[PDB]
Structure 1
């Protein structure tokens, strides 16, 4: 795992590849690693019994007093 400190450099470019998914250095090596060490049973095996779940995203605003205290906090960071 301290060789995975060099792969912790990979782990910070894992944020950079969350931006840019076009690298393959550890993933096939993890396919070598994760044929042991892990055993995945999927949601698809279990949700086929169940129905569906759907997230609905609802935005909001700030009231005058609320935005006033929020930029009072921005004056506080000022």
Structure 2
């Protein structure tokens, strides 16, 4: 019986607090009880974990430049989009097939 911890037994040990605080990352800067669960996870994962970012190799490493391109909508595709979206909002919000 060398089991690590049950999928339900891992919900007490971090788990629900982790995705509770983390998904509410706006208040995650409080780090009063969040640091407890984060530290527990770090300690429990240290025996089996190994991660190294691009900080280990940076002397000759071109950087990444993220760019977002905005595209307009064509006339007949706009017609298609409006028709489909109005039909979907009329069907889903109420009785349907």
Scaled by the length of structure 2, the TM-score of the pair is: 0.61
1:13-24 superposed matches below 5 A: 13=20, 14-17=22-25, 19-22=26-29, 23-24=34-35
Give the 3 Å change call, closer, same or farther, for CA 12–39 of structure 1 in structure 2.
closer
RMSD, matched Cα: 2.1
Which residue of structure 2 aligns with residue 53 of structure 1? 64
For the structure 1 residues 20 and 66, does the alpha-carbon distance in structure 2 shift closer, same or farther, using more than 3 Å as the test?
farther
Higher relative contact order (CA 8 A, sep 6+): 2
- The unaligned stretches of length 5 or more in structure 2 are 1-6, 91-97
Question: Structure 1 length normalisation: TM-score?
Answer: 0.72
Provide runs of 4+ in structure 1 moved above 6 Å.
Answer: none
Unaligned runs of 5+ in 1: none
